[PDB]
Symmetry: D3
Subunit: 237 residues, 6 copies
């Protein structure tokens, strides 16, 4: 057991899907995993392990922010033998042509956090995902007939930022989605020797202030999960 | 309701106690509040409202990290009329003369996060607590026969730091305890015109190592909460 | 015996009052101290030691700016056994409700200087005063029927700043007064393990030029010194 | 004609391969392009246009360093209709398992340059290549039976760096190759709206101080060019 | 008429000599100037104006540190029509070949202060002297049969720095002397369009403590003042 | 031979003139040197050696940008015995009173590059030229009846800057011309113990726009070279 996870080596699969919301992790287990059993509940951060088409798989929430997901991903990698981490969350769009419920794959992640500068002697560390995992997700999406843009995400420390002008800068440089974890998870993956990928579905528009509605939320969220789970199967082949 | 809190104005008291763990919020409401009702459960971040010696009081978790607690504290202050936030948590010690089960009060909070620089034109913003709240807590602690240390806390972004040299630095400049939120909460308090205070009990000595949990540890955690609750009453007069 | 102070261990009391203007040191010694004797003249920075109601106290100017006061406070602390430093000066206000002649106490001090970043591995060090000293000052003021605000000060490196926009920022974050030393003194105190406090009287409003009589100004200054001196006696009990 | 390129719209193909050495560009034209004609010689930065299997293609050197390649890539994109840029250069390895003449594909590029911070309001911009171009190069390499690692490169401003310790940091974070342009080219691509990719062949080892030798240089360099040219054909399909 | 100088336009010459120690201003006026008259006494920073071989010249101390001298130089330039400022002080050496009592002329000044970054949008501003003033000083020294080195000075914010390693760096880059004002004065001169120069005599070797007689020290000081004064006359021709 | 220069000790004079364009190096050798032989052609960066009025002199291009010229100048200094480097190039003007065809001498060079901060512990290193070389050039220019301006240059990393606001800044602080190398060369000179100087002719006014090239422009370029060559002879005596 680690400081934030009460479990033993073997309780988690070698691949773990992670939404920020622990309640969403429970939903994923009940909706997609077979023989799903709870493996963690410390601080209410629910974690589950089961199978998807005979493949052992785990799912656990990671909380909001780089500092929170950094704790959980690190402990999984160093004390539970987890080799691949797939964040499955929501994000805000800054580009006019990016629509609600769109699916985005972060090959890279920009950030205003200082964590990677602390790791990289104050220089620029390009926080990137594992290439094979990115390609697996693209193919899986293709097979499901679901569209998906591949590019840069922006991991923000402040959901309520006092610098609205920065959104113009994000847009100018082609940021596909604004979330709060990618850059940190990618930094941990590199520091502790594992592989990671972040997939998001546009839950709202930063400008239009339009947000998730109706039952489009479930279908779309379920599509993201399908892509993630299926992408792992391609990875195993 | 707000993006992360599904409740309405009036559901929260004008003073909120905030542990990092949602389950601790439930433990506090159950142990110290009378007629307590759950007022939020979004993302499992349980919030409650009840009364302490006739005084209307609320308690809700804030998750781990500056980005997390910044979201909740901001929503409380701007949408639920909250005027005071009192974080009640745990910290690691750096100073040798600081023993286990000591109660620490953060008059100020250092940090390796970039949020306050983003707010303050890249200069040094001294993240501090509200003076009257610090005095109220010091006075409540004395009335309970408990001696509290008042000084600087260090709010870290990485629980698992790559550095290590930074701890010699914290010790050299007198940091009393290391946690992950005070600096963020104090920044939010200043930005939106509210009042905040952070109180912590030493859970372990990053020096002599070994934490604390048992009868004596649990007794000290309860003293911290009584100090927080009693300080509110002093403030009311 | 020291590069900027020609005196020996024992010539200074363990408590020193420090105005910015050297001329004020002699005024304080003649007006408030008994049996005063000169203890320093190097570079014209006159120092005196005497007693106030029986308590041994010293007074000496520190010069304008962080670099200057950093030199004097360090030498006093490391070579003359000084335990407490109380800076007594003037400041400019940016908040509308802060009036001319108001007495301000800096529990913390923000700054655009780099000295603390150089000390704290380029992270954010919260430059704070000693809490007991702050409370002693507040109570001494109350006993003298004087109103005193406690909060953040801003220590500027440039009296004539090219960045006019920074004052709006200071106002937005509740800065009480603008001066040029606090954050530097607090940094030295933390570095060499001593205690410090900065008390200031509002000499001007950086937006609405006001007017004061020469007599009103001497009265306010004498009030600040009385607060400082009486606060020391409170700290002794 | 632009300040550094004497040519007119239409003289360059929509895709341009770029080695740092202009003499190498001439070699590529003579060895791989048909009906190759010189289109630029200003400052000796040779540029050529011809066909590869009926596909119109250009090749021009870009000089050494981010400031130099930034000039040329920008002018090609804004005044010559160039849509894809493929840098084909050499790099130094820092990882023990990365061998001489190995082929590396930079999906991302870290850097110690300040150019991207100047563009991204002093935050972290993840300098990444175009995903489709990366995948095209991987497939092309596969078809040719040539191996190729996909990952992060490090664009250095100083070939002769006074900070040797940084190489330990690069190695720790999995940097595949050390060159001097990738991060800048990726920044320009994003700023002016085009697509780019950097491919390198390990010409030496930073540690072992071993470098290119025998005729392995030509064969290996010719393999890189084959991958680049063929990857474009896949892109057109 | 100015916040730190109680005088009117015309009271100061268009050329001002400035020592750090206020006491030196009166010494220079009595020892080198004719028909001197006092023109300032605020805060004990005594100012004088007289003539040297017919030329009108003023002398006044500037206090220790960049913040202090920045205030005085700015006011003199913007409100008293001062065209040239010559700082005359002491410094510590880090280079072995730089001997005690050596006369050093700072053509440029490095610094660990943030004032120039605040002025120059966080980029590197090369704080330099006026070239003619530098050459005038060199020639005046030669005519007086005195040896003078011209190069870089380092303006420190902290006389007592916690970073001992920085002196090795200064030595490696050829720093001639360490003081605490040059870069600040040069910054002010550039900001308000005036000319400046800093001349210093080596008072100590920050590595090999030496010894000097009180008489040798007065001789060197008088030599520096003669160089400064004669350099002004050369500049007039 | 070195990594970028295929020559042997003795092939270069102890003084090298360096234009940015390789073709200009050929133009200079052909126009001003007698018995000139080509000594390098690696990457097309032509270098030559010959004599001027009996004095052994070399001239070689350095490419565009700090990273480029840093490579060549370092190799020359450490492997070919070069003791002086004189950059002879073009710059854009910012100050209105600075006209076309003016000869500018960079006593110092500001920059937006990070190379000197990397060398100088992240502090401000004042990149300056060698005093005697500046004086030699000023004296040679006078003997030729040419009036040269001596001051600060600004070495930019981006020829096509995203900012734009920075030019108002350069103008405000008196920058004489904008180029892309001086700061890098001065940093290399300090790091390896050599001497350097940069001379430029204004090719255009970033203000009034419109460059200069024709008889009068070419005459001024030749004057700069004569100034450089004649300054070497003065230095020899
Ligand atoms: N505009 C926005 N800015 C930052 N994060 C945003 C967001 N919209 C959705 N998110 C996603 O949900 C969480 C917080 O609501 C975050 O963890 C996650 O990024
Ligand atoms: N050494 C340490 N570093 C960082 N956070 C520490 C800590 N010791 C306790 N904490 C406290 O508990 C949470 C994470 O365990 C954090 O929310 C909170 O700060
Ligand atoms: N508006 C203002 N800005 C900065 N400093 C101010 C000030 N008003 C008074 N001061 C006080 O006097 C000194 C410098 O004038 C400083 O030491 C001290 O803060
Ligand atoms: N160790 C090293 N550090 C930096 N750049 C290196 C290199 N080895 C090869 N290069 C490649 O060739 C050019 C300079 O020789 C550079 O343009 C390119 O990066
Ligand atoms: N080693 C040293 N470091 C810093 N400043 C030094 C010094 N030796 C003399 N000084 C001179 O006296 C003042 C402060 O002592 C400074 O104004 C001035 O530079
Ligand atoms: N406005 C400007 N910005 C940057 N560099 C400038 C320039 N005007 C001329 N240059 C000079 O010519 C080269 C690039 O054209 C550069 O090497 C050299 O600096």
């Amino acid at each position: 057991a680690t400081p934030h996870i009460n479990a033993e080596m073997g309780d988690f699969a070698d691949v773990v899907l992670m939404p920020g919301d622990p309640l969403r992790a429970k939903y994923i287990a009940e909706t997609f995993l077979e023989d799903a059993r709870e493996v963690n509940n410390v601080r209410g951060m629910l974690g589950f392990t089961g199978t998807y088409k005979g493949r052992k798989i785990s799912v656990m929430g990671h909380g909001m922010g780089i500092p929170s997901c950094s704790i959980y991903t690190k402990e999984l990698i160093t004390d539970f033998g987890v080799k691949k981490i797939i964040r499955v969350g929501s994000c805000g769009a800054v580009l006019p042509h990016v629509k609600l419920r769109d699916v985005v794959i972060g090959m890279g992640a920009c950030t205003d956090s200082k964590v990677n500068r602390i790791r990289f002697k104050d220089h620029d560390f390009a926080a990137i995902a594992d290439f094979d995992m990115v390609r697996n997700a693209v193919d899986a999406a293709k097979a499901l007939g679901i569209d998906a843009r591949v590019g840069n995400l922006f991991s923000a420390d402040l959901f309520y930022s006092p610098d609205g002008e920065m959104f113009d800068v994000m847009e100018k440089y082609g940021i596909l989605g604004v979330e709060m974890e990618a850059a940190g998870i990618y930094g941990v993956a590199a520091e502790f020797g594992a592989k990671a990928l972040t997939i998001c579905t546009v839950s709202d528009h930063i400008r239009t202030h339009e947000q998730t509605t109706a039952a489009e939320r479930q279908t779309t969220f379920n599509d993201m999960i399908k892509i993630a789970l299926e992408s792992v199967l391609l990875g195993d082949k």
